[PDB]
Amino acid sequence: EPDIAQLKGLSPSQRQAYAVQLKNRGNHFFTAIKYYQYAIELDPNEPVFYSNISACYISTGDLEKVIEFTTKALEIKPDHSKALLRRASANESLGNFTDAMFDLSVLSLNGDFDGASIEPMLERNLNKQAMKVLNENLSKQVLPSNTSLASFFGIFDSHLEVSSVNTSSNYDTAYALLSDALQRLYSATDEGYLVANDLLTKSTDMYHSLLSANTVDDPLRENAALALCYTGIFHFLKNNLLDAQVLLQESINLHPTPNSYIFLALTLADKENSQEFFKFFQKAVDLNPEYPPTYYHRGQMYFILQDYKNAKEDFQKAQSLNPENVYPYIQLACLLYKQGKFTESEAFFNETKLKFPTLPEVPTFFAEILTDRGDFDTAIKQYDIAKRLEEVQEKIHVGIGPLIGKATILARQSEKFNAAIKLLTKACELDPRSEQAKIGLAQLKLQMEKIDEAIELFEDSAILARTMDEKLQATTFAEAAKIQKRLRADPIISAKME
Ligand SMILES: [Cl-]
Ligand SMILES: [Cl-]
Numbered sequence: 001e002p003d004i005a006q007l008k009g010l011s012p013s014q015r016q017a018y019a020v021q022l023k024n025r026g027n028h029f030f031t032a033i034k035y036y037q038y039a040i041e042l043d044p045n046e047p048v049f050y051s052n053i054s055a056c057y058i059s060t061g062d063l064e065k066v067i068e069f070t071t072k073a074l075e076i077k078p079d080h081s082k083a084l085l086r087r088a089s090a091n092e093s094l095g096n097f098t099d100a101m102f103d104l105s106v107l108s109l110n111g112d113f114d115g116a117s118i119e120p121m122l123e124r125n126l127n128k129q130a131m132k133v134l135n136e137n138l139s140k141q142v143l144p145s146n147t148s149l150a151s152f153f154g155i156f157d158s159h160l161e162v163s164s165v166n167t168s169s170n171y172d173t174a175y176a177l178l179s180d181a182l183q184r185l186y187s188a189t190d191e192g193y194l195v196a197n198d199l200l201t202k203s204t205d206m207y208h209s210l211l212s213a214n215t216v217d218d219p220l221r222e223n224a225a226l227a228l229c230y231t232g233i234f235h236f237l238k239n240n241l242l243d244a245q246v247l248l249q250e251s252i253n254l255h256p257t258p259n260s261y262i263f264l265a266l267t268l269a270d271k272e273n274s275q276e277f278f279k280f281f282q283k284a285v286d287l288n289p290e291y292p293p294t295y296y297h298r299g300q301m302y303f304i305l306q307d308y309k310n311a312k313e314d315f316q317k318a319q320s321l322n323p324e325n326v327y328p329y330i331q332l333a334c335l336l337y338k339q340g341k342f343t344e345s346e347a348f349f350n351e352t353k354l355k356f357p358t359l360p361e362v363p364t365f366f367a368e369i370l371t372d373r374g375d376f377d378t379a380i381k382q383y384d385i386a387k388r389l390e391e392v393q394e395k396i397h398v399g400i401g402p403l404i405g406k407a408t409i410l411a412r413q414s415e416k417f418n419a420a421i422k423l424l425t426k427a428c429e430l431d432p433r434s435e436q437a438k439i440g441l442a443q444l445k446l447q448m449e450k451i452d453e454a455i456e457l458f459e460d461s462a463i464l465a466r467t468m469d470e471k472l473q474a475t476t477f478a479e480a481a482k483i484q485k486r487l488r489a490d491p492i493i494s495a496k497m498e
């Protein structure tokens with residue numbers, strides 16, 4: 001109704017004075033947008049007009065307009081508390097979680113606001129942003145670390161496995177390759193795992209071809225089942241659960257074996273419903289009640305489930321079937337510890353050490369328990385002993401586990417900080433597929449303000465991580481650090497961060 005174009009043609013002072021009057025009218029209509037817009041048309045240099053309009057759009061629910069006009073207020077007064085809080089809210093609603101965390105971060109730098117009163121919204125936006133990025137990445141061929149692989153295959157009898165290839169077929173022209181793949185697998189070396197993965201795939205292809213012919217042997221079917229079994233579990237280790245189940249069932253259909261059932265159970269495992277897991281292991285036991293790895297793997301599930309009695313019996317059975325394998329001893333000692341029986345656990349570890357004096361598995365798992373007890377001094381010494389034993393072994397036993405355990409004690413103890421960096425850097429070099437090593441190193445990079453390097457280690461770690469929870473954890477660290485990068489990139493912000 002007032003003629004704004006006409007008022008626009010008046011002197012700056014008149015326009016400024018008329019604009020206050022227009023804004024005043026707007027404030028009344030508060031009982032509005034039209035009058036604030038009029039005010040802005042006349043004097044675009046008053047943040048009050050923009051902040052007032054943005055309050056209108058909150059009322060009307062126009063989120064995009066709230067962003068537009070809070071931003072206009074903030075261009076003039078970048079620490080306008082009301083505008084920062086409104087823009088963060090609208091941004092959170094629109095799914096712009098990074099922009100919400102940036103404005104909430106700037107807000108906290110205002111000493112008028114208790115950091116603790118803003119942290120819950122920073123945290124909520126961070127978790128939303130991590131889940132957004134994780135889901136995007138999931139929506140749009142790498143092995144676990146050599147340390148993890150040595151651990152996974154540690155229970156099996158290397159010589160038994162390699163010898164399980166049948167040389168009596170009249171049709172099997174492929175078995176030398178399967179024999180080679182298993183020899184390389186059970187070498188427990190860096191080269192071994194890489195080689196095993198490619199050679200098991202190639203073997204499986206060759207068996208798929210031989211099985212397609214009109215003439216096939218039982219010895220042949222058994223070798224094909226064995227290739228499929230190990231290729232299946234490699235799929236599982238590569239986080240390809242679907243192709244894992246397919247090949248493992250193919251294997252079982254050809255020639256049911258304990259390993260085939262153990263590997264299938266592992267692939268489909270879920271502690272929150274256990275029934276199928278235990279049926280698969282009972283069938284594995286049926287196929288060979290004297291096979292130690294069946295009982296050991298079932299004991300681990302009972303352990304996870306806190307069925308300590310059944311876990312003890314299964315580990316004892318694995319132990320009695322193959323007393324020369326250190327793993328059932330370790331788990332028995334760990335079982336004692338988790339039941340609050342540290343003194344018995346410690347005695348069991350000491351007896352195990354006498355039986356296996358050169359194996360770093362013993363001090364490594366014992367150091368883990370001491371760390372859990374807060375006995376950081378003694379844990380360091382046990383990690384030191386494990387590290388020295390590991391370095392001199394021919395095979396991988398505990399891999400970089402000791403370097404990680406020691407660095408982690410040193411890093412949070414706090415001089416030693418450089419010692420922690422050197423340990424974790426060595427660990428990353430020795431076992432480049434270890435997400436544990438990358439994440440530990442990234443945490444220290446953050447503390448010395450190498451944020452770009454942190455981000456890269458975190459993101460690489462999420463791609464490496466196997467479980468959804470571990471992928472989400474590493475994504476969360478990456479997304480948090482990207483916010484840090486963004487804040488540090490503004491020198492005014494960065495000075496206030498000091
Ligand atoms: Cl007028
Ligand atoms: Cl204005």
Ligand SMILES: [Cl-]
Nearest residue numbers: 127128130131
């Ligand atoms: Cl999350």
Ligand SMILES: [Cl-]
Nearest residue numbers: 399400402403
């Ligand atoms: Cl080590």
